[PDB]
Design a protein around this ligand. Structure first.
Ligand SMILES: CCCC(=O)OC[C@H](COP(=O)(O)O)OC(=O)CCC
Length: 501
């Protein structure tokens, strides 16, 4: 079956980062979206799972996520690979890891386990890698002797604010769960106002691609344990750091197909791991029109750095996914814009891509977390805008720079843009007064191809990872289970841009 959206994205990735193919990005065939029996859309792991249920008393999506995480780890024969934003997995996320590992050992296995978290320079890690390792060993009991642990917290650039933000669980290089969900009990479990988020589960060659991505992070992490300012590392049982655990498990044989789904795995190396993909001939004419509402203090990696693109192919993967839309594109995000300064306020090429779609008659929907969400920098579901106008006004600006006059800009903007704050029920706020917070990193185009992962569309220079799937059947499930319900409730919080009926 034809894959016109993946083909376009693949061309962009091979132009941007040819040397990173097979490590930081990879297209594979023959994957399976990992759904349980009798629940065909069950590969889509939404949390809390309460569409149209303002009370959200039964948080069935959260339970299904933790169950699936546990089962995947319980099935581990050789390797368990976990990455997240700090802190190390706690609460029910930790129970899933402990329970799964105990089951793997009870089945006769001696699994190797890597657990990697990224830490902002300002973030104080309460439970450091040595203490987290020790806590796990205690909870593992007698099984701890059979489990090889590598536990590490990392920061790759202090000045350029770069650390691991990818959210991955990869087992045996064969199954993978990824998305926006941090293993942080205070955002999803121990809370009266849970964040809305989505992960996906697959099996097949693209799970190995995720493993190769984590091998790239652990190669750097193991080497830079020589600098405790950057890396804190703890291992169990006297074990060495395992930079290439996924390659060792993969061996020489190619990954075995498990279904028929084509997937592009794509991530980025942030800042401070690798300065450029230096086999790349990528030579963009980077955007000339700068956001006159803000100026970045730091060097602008998002909008003004060729080298950064070459080691962060996920940036161009998302731009080319959006650019591939022939009929309609749905964007569901925490934010489209970043707090500026210190980061650039928006990705210029992304907004220019969206403006081009609006002017060409392509339907564009943007749903973001409500601006009433104000949290600390790094909180899930926070918003970085005061009003949805900051999105529509910027689109209007880029439209004028493209069409030439404001009246054409208005016809494109008013006729083809849907813009709203996220809602999951008829209720505007939670019972405890707090508003709904959205943490998706999702893009879907033409009900044919979609991204689910950890990479936000707003500017950020972190290590991130995600999958782009092209499958009309899977995108129909996504539409039915997530996108249509999202708009059913979010349209009650829609914006009418300035200058529109
Ligand atoms: C500071 C520039 C990068 C950034 O702002 O990163 C925010 C991120 C939130 O990511 P997200 O939840 O919106 O996906 O949190 C963290 O990485 C650090 C927590 C202290």
């Amino acid at each position: 079956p034809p894959t016109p959206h993946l083909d376009a994205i693949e061309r962009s990735l091979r132009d941007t980062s040819p040397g990173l193919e097979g490590s930081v990005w990879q297209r594979t065939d023959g994957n399976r979206l990992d759904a349980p029996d009798g629940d065909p859309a069950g590969w889509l792991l939404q949390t809390p799972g309460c569409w149209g249920d303002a009370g959200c008393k039964d948080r069935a999506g959260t339970r299904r996520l933790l169950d699936k995480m546990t089962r995947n780890i319980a099935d581990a024969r050789h390797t368990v690979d976990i990455s997240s934003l700090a802190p190390f997995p706690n609460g029910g996320f930790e129970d899933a890891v402990v329970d799964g590992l105990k089951a793997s050992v009870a089945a006769g296995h001696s699994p190797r386990v890597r657990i990697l978290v990224g830490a902002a320079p300002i973030y104080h890690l309460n439970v450091v890698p040595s203490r987290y390792r020790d806590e796990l060993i205690g909870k593992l009991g007698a099984a701890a002797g059979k489990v090889t642990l590598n536990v590490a917290s990392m920061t790759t650039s202090k000045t350029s604010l770069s650390w691991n933000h990818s959210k991955l669980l990869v087992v045996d290089g064969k199954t993978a769960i990824t998305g926006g969900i941090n293993t942080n009990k205070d955002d999803y479990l121990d809370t009266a106002h849970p964040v809305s988020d989505v992960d996906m589960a697959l099996s097949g060659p693209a799970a190995r691609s995720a493993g190769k991505y984590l091998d790239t992070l652990w190669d750097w992490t193991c080497r830079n344990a020589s600098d405790p300012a950057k890396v804190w590392l703890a291992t169990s049982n006297g074990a060495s750091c395992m930079p290439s655990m996924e390659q060792d498990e993969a061996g020489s044989a190619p990954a075995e197909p498990t279904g028929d789904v084509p997937v592009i795995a794509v991530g980025g190396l942030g800042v401070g791991i690798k300065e450029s993909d230096p086999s790349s001939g990528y030579h963009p004419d980077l955007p000339t029109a700068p956001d006159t509402k803000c100026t970045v203090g730091l060097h602008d990696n998002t909008n003004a750095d060729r080298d950064y693109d070459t080691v962060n192919p996920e940036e161009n993967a998302l731009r080319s996914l959006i650019a591939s839309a022939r009929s309609h594109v749905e964007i569901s995000q925490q934010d489209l814009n970043a707090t500026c300064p210190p980061l650039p306020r928006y990705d210029i090429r992304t907004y220019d891509t969206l403006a081009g779609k609006l002017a060409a008659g392509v339907k564009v929907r943007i749903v973001v977390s409500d601006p009433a969400n104000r949290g600390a920098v790094g909180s899930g579901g926070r918003s970085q805008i005061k009003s949805l106008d900051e999105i529509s006004d910027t689109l209007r600006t880029r439209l004028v720079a493209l069409t030439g006059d404001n009246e054409k800009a208005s016809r494109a903007l008013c006729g083809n843009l849907q813009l709203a704050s996220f809602r999951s029920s008829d209720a505007a706020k939670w019972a405890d007064g707090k508003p709904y917070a959205l943490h998706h990193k999702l893009v879907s185009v033409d009900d044919s191809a979609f991204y689910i992962g950890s990479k936000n569309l707003y500017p950020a220079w972190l290590q991130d990872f995600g999958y782009i799937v092209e499958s009309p059947a899977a995108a129909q499930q996504l539409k039915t289970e997530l996108l249509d319900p999202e708009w059913k409730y979010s349209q009650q919080a829609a914006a009418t841009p300035a200058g529109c009926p």
